[PDB]
Amino acid sequence: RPRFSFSIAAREGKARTGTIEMKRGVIRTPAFMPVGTAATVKALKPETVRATGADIILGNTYHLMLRPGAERIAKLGGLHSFMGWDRPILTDSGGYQVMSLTKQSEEGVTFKSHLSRHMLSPERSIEIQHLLGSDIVMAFDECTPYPATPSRAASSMERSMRWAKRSRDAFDSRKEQAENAALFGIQQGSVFENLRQQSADALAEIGFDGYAVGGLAVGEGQDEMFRVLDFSVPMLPDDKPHYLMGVGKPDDIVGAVERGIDMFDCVLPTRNGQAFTWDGPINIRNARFSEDLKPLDSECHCAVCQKWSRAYIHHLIRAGEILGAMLMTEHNIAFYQQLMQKIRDSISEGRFSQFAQDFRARYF
Amino acid sequence: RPRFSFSIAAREGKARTGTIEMKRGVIRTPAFMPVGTAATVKALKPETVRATGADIILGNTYHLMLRPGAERIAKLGGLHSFMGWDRPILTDSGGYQVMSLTKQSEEGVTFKSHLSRHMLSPERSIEIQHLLGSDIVMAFDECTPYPATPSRAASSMERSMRWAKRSRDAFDSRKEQAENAALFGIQQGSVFENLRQQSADALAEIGFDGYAVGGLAVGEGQDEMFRVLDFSVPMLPDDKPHYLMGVGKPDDIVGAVERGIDMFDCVLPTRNGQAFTWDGPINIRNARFSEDLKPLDSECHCAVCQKWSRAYIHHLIRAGEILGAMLMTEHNIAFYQQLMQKIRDSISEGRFSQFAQDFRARYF
Ligand SMILES: NCc1cc(CSc2ccccc2)c2nc(N)[nH]c(=O)c2c1
Ligand SMILES: NCc1cc(CSc2ccccc2)c2nc(N)[nH]c(=O)c2c1
Ligand SMILES: [Zn+2]
Ligand SMILES: [Zn+2]
């Protein structure tokens, strides 16, 4: 396969469905990428993650650069070999996480490990992602708090764009990385239209393989997020993937696809007790499920719903058993993948708008 | 298959190898039974437990009678359906656990839940095991502390024998249970030969499908345990299974089989960091494994050793990841099953004594 090839097979309104071809495999879009925190998708073997239908997973750089360390993972053969996942892996730049879990400057960010002093710059972020063996590398950007004043949002966005250029050059100056991986730029600008436009223009001028909409899902609310996506997504190059970072609630995903987003990721799927169903989420810890012999969801095709009851999983979670987390997580990730499949098929068949309507009606 | 049929196919010295045929499946002996605490073998799906080679698992009655409750499990269809394990399940009587995790009397034991007031008697213990749908029911016995004076050991053993008779009658008075399950008696008597003899004689007079050697593995040390087994096992009926409760260290198992034991169980296999290998146990948390690309064990045929390195599992356990527990547990249970297979094959081939010798030499 080629290093990177995004092809759009069908469209409906702003929604698109297609594929991203990479050396390690094909990614069907719209896609949901399960998140692995410490070189592992919480409570699941890689084969199980694949069984749910995932084509790509997200690697949590921040934690990996601290433990076991980027250099160490490289010495061990790379993240793919390390964790046993041979398909595409997208890695975040680590900067956003650092400013959430820190001396900031135009050169980067210095911070103390939450679990020592560490320095992170656009150049070091790209190098770390290279050492991990990432297939999709994210540009190193600055976190823009919410709410943010227009002045602060502008300064942050402008810095991010300068860092986007440094990320591009660092990526290109490394032969092995430039020829085998892809690089995504990240749009910033808070909730301001003019800033989002400036960011999109700057990103397009530099040129990237894909464009992420960053700075959202920071407590603005779905209404506000959708409002921002309405004018923000069309600003990005149409022929490249659009990735909405950190968005995963089912209803958020459907609305985001309706607005042109092609890729998603979130830790929501992965012992809270919340299980997603087509009739809305349920918390399995609730006493009403203690003797419910039905599966988590009545239509779900996952292995958990074929073999165990709500009553059993209820018992597991309330007992604090590891198997409870294993089963809840497999079902949730399987549910998310089934949602993406329904979205892809509906778009391919030109009935996505209707699917969105039916989904919402039953989910709520 | 029949309700219960133990057949001895081959012998060498005091060691035996054969099968126990039951309605839900065949159990190969010597057998190792993985222990499931709360209706689950720690961090493993039932299919994975079976994949390791286990023919039967042990159900932890004490915890189940408290959560989710015996009556509830019965309402839900039984433990087999509940947890998704359709093969034989052996359940302990719960009395021993109660006196470890309490007003005692000739009628039974009253106690307060560690996680309310509850009463447990020989009759109630058998009923609980019936409600759980146990295939191999253990007689309700009294815990004999260690060390124990001859007088106290005698009183406890005598009470246990009276309770063994009550267990037998309770079991037989329940048609469905008597016709579909098996009942094992438990020998007591501490480390005293005369008491063990009295207990064995009492148990044989009553008549059981199998006989367990109880009261050992209570801090006496392998030397002392082996000394007690030397004279205790021959006292039990030769044509019925001999089950050593709570014994599982690899070397203990080999020595116990050399002394006539056919069944084992222990929580040792199931984030401590200890992984069993043919060259002895290792603690994966040790820094020396941080960049060790080799599998847990060089010969082990389990899925964990075929796919992941010590370095990765080291990272997982030190990071507190659930997958670490999943992988460590699967390997350990697989290792135990491989040990039992080597024991069974060596006995069948009349070279068990040699196997024991070679095992010890390399393990230590
Ligand atoms: N709060 C939404 C969100 C989430 C992430 C994290 S995406 C991620 C990172 C590591 C593991 C899994 C997902 C972001 N990352 C970057 N670089 N920029 C953003 O604007 C942003 C916004
Ligand atoms: N300390 C060894 C040991 C362990 C168990 C517990 S075996 C078990 C119970 C529940 C779950 C798994 C294994 C015992 N149980 C009974 N009834 N009698 C004993 O003498 C004895 C000695
Ligand atoms: Zn499901
Ligand atoms: Zn192994």
UniProtKB/Swiss-Prot annotation, chains A, B:
Cofactor names: Zn(2+)
Alphabetized UniProt keyword annotations: Glycosyltransferase, Metal-binding, Queuosine biosynthesis, Transferase, tRNA processing, Zinc
GO molecular function, one term: tRNA-guanosine(34) queuine transglycosylase activity
Ligand binding (substrate): D92, S93, G94, G95, Y96, D141, Q188, G215
Broad EC category: transferase
Cofactor note: Binds 1 zinc ion per subunit.
Protein's name according to its UniProt entry: Queuine tRNA-ribosyltransferase
